[PDB]
Design an enzyme around this catalytic site. Sequence first.
Site, PDB file in Angstrom:
ATOM      1  N   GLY A   1     -60.854 -37.275 -13.304  1.00 33.42           N
ATOM      2  CA  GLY A   1     -61.428 -36.866 -11.742  1.00 33.42           C
ATOM      3  C   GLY A   1     -59.950 -37.985 -11.321  1.00 33.42           C
TER       4      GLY A   1
ATOM      5  CB  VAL B   1     -51.897 -41.666 -15.505  1.00 37.25           C
ATOM      6  CG1 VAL B   1     -51.355 -42.560 -16.006  1.00 37.25           C
ATOM      7  CG2 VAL B   1     -52.656 -41.977 -14.468  1.00 37.25           C
TER       8      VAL B   1
ATOM      9  CB  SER C   1     -56.070 -35.602 -17.662  1.00 38.30           C
ATOM     10  OG  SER C   1     -56.215 -35.103 -18.816  1.00 38.30           O
TER      11      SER C   1
ATOM     12  N   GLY D   1     -57.333 -37.694 -11.571  1.00 50.74           N
ATOM     13  CA  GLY D   1     -55.747 -37.471 -11.910  1.00 50.74           C
ATOM     14  C   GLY D   1     -55.129 -37.197 -13.252  1.00 50.74           C
TER      15      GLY D   1
ATOM     16  CG  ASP E   1     -59.560 -47.665 -22.226  1.00 53.10           C
ATOM     17  OD1 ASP E   1     -59.683 -48.351 -22.865  1.00 53.10           O
ATOM     18  OD2 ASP E   1     -60.293 -46.789 -20.968  1.00 53.10           O
TER      19      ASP E   1
ATOM     20  CG  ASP F   1     -64.540 -46.419 -10.191  1.00 57.32           C
ATOM     21  OD1 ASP F   1     -65.516 -46.857 -11.125  1.00 57.32           O
ATOM     22  OD2 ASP F   1     -63.963 -45.198 -11.043  1.00 57.32           O
TER      23      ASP F   1
END
Length: 273
Positions: free
Chosen positions: A16, A20, A14, A18, A96, A135
């Site tokens: 900026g 997930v 979580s 939102g 990631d 981004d």
Amino acid sequence: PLESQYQVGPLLGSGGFGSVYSGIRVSDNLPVAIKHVEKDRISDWGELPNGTRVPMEVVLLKKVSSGFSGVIRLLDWFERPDSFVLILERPEPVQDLFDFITERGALQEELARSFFWQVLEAVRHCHNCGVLHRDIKDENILIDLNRGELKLIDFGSGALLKDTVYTDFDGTRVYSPPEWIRYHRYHGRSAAVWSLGILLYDMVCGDIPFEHDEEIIRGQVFFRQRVSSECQHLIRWCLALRPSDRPTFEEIQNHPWMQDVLLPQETAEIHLH
Ligand SMILES: CC(C)(C)CNC(=O)C[C@H]1CNC(=O)c2cc(-c3ccsc3)cn21
């Protein structure tokens, strides 16, 4: 409708963007991510082909959906009274690029080449679909660890691609180009190439090259790790201060450093398994 269709698992992240969550599609057990964004927090709004007011990310993700696995696929979305909920495909196992680099340090160039190539293919796909991500960064790239495939995520700061100047930006500042820093103005593709040079530096050095606005503006690149001359050249080219001095996507992919990329499966075999 939403709560019955998906089994919500743990929170994945979580911030900026939102919140997930990991999820599973009840119907076929497909791994998904469930992204919640509060309505008040939504930067840009768009409208669907059939004219429905949605977050821009929904518009953008629909525009990039096809059999191509380089961009995270939007499976479904839902409107709630005070939020939108996006259902995304979720690779499993996944990591990631930020965590991958954190744990492994600077990437071998062969690996960075494969990864950077896939990012370039994903970004070209977005641009070809009229979508600008805005981004591009290690935290917005997922690695499908089994397949060696990267997926671009989070179009929450994205925009329709255009040929005129952008004067808004809400992506990540340390990946944003000097023209944005100085003038609050940039063009889509050349700003993207800047962020790609930051990303490539990040891959081969283990950290981003600039932290402060002053460093971004100076654009002087110092290599903290041993990086090949050809890789350094490409980075410095992507990070040209003048946007028109930056390579086009075609020029990046034709660069000597980019030749003989590994296939994603070879990449997983050699580097991930
Ligand atoms: C690497 C993770 C363990 C998945 C954690 N990262 C995030 O939650 C980042 C977050 C940023 N914004 C997004 O839109 C987003 C999509 C996803 C995602 C998509 C498929 S699996 C996870 C994840 N995100």
